Amino acid sequence: HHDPASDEFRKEDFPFYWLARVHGRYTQNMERLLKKIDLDVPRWRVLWILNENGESSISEISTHAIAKLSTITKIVYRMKEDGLVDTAPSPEDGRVTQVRITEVGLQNIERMQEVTRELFQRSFKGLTEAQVQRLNRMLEVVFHNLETL
Amino acid sequence: HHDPASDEFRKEDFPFYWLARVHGRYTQNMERLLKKIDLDVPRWRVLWILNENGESSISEISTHAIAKLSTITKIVYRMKEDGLVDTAPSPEDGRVTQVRITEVGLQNIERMQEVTRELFQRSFKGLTEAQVQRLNRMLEVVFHNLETL
Ligand SMILES: O=C(O)Cc1c[nH]c2ccccc12
Ligand SMILES: O=C(O)Cc1c[nH]c2ccccc12
């Protein structure tokens, strides 16, 4: 039922169908919420990456934000204009740009934590903490499977 | 660990992080494969929707392909030029465009079934049929949860 090469294929039994539907609805709702505090999904991701990893290159940010280097560069310098991040040439390689979050960026993290609280309360309604962890593990397994292609 | 409002938040424990990573890697690999037979992810989706549901409006296609009505309209008339679909005004409402798959579209379905076979063999490696069904059910639950916002 979940095999596109089968005659029994049904999108409603196809994990990637519901994955894409979830990605789209989640993205739309997050864009709506973050707009209220002058943010968006790419800047939400960049801020979380900087908050977890400290100083980060454009390349590392791009990997974890799922965006092109050009997109991340534009977003990063926009955030720097707004005061949310600062940048500096990497000492190892002047070609490589290092980005770090500012105290204003951290305040923006607090704002995005508050404004999305209800969405994340609702998102996993009906699922236990073990079920959520199992969802997470299975998604990571699929990701690693796709990295072998 | 999976709660963005928590001090313990870690993206690697956050279902939406792995969901987005999977969506991106899956999309890139599918684009690569479908390009070999002159297709892409949006046309793969449109063909599956038409193959399952028969004659379908632009709106229904757009819902299930996760795209804007304008995007789907352009894709649909491109596919019609290439002979993969045909269109007709809906009898109920001349404003509404009905799309149906052609025998050439069905042949393209067979080609996309063949060219992605290995990706789908690899995608669920290490997961049993029950685990895949549980992944599917949990994703549908999250989707329905997000529809309440
Ligand atoms: O791109 C994918 O394979 C997932 C997907 C999203 N909408 C779809 C409609 C029909 C079949 C698959 C999909
Ligand atoms: O948009 C999301 O919430 C998922 C996501 C993708 N990359 C991320 C990096 C850090 C935190 C969340 C995400």
Numbering used by the authors:
A (entry chain A), B (entry chain A): 19 to 167
From the paper:
We characterize the binding of IAA to MarR-family regulators from both iac and iad loci. Most characterized MarR-family regulators function as repressors by binding to an operator sequence upstream of the genes they control. When a relevant ligand binds the MarR repressor, it releases from DNA, allowing gene expression. The structures of MarRs from representatives of each auxin degradation operon type establish that each has distinct IAA-binding pockets.
MarR proteins were produced from three iad and three iac loci and their binding affinities for IAA were measured. Crystal structures for the IAA-binding IacR MarRs from P. putida, E. soli and A. baumannii and IadR MarR from B. japonicum were determined and refined to 1.5–2.8 Å resolution. The contacts between MarR and IAA ligand are typified for the iadR group by MarR_73 and the iacR group by P. putida 1290 MarR_iacR. Further, by examining the binding of MarR-family regulators from both locus types and solving crystal structures for five of these MarRs, we demonstrated that IadR MarRs (for example, Variovorax MarR_73) have stronger binding affinity for IAA than their iac-like counterparts, probably caused by optimized coordination of the IAA carboxyl group in their MarR binding pocket.
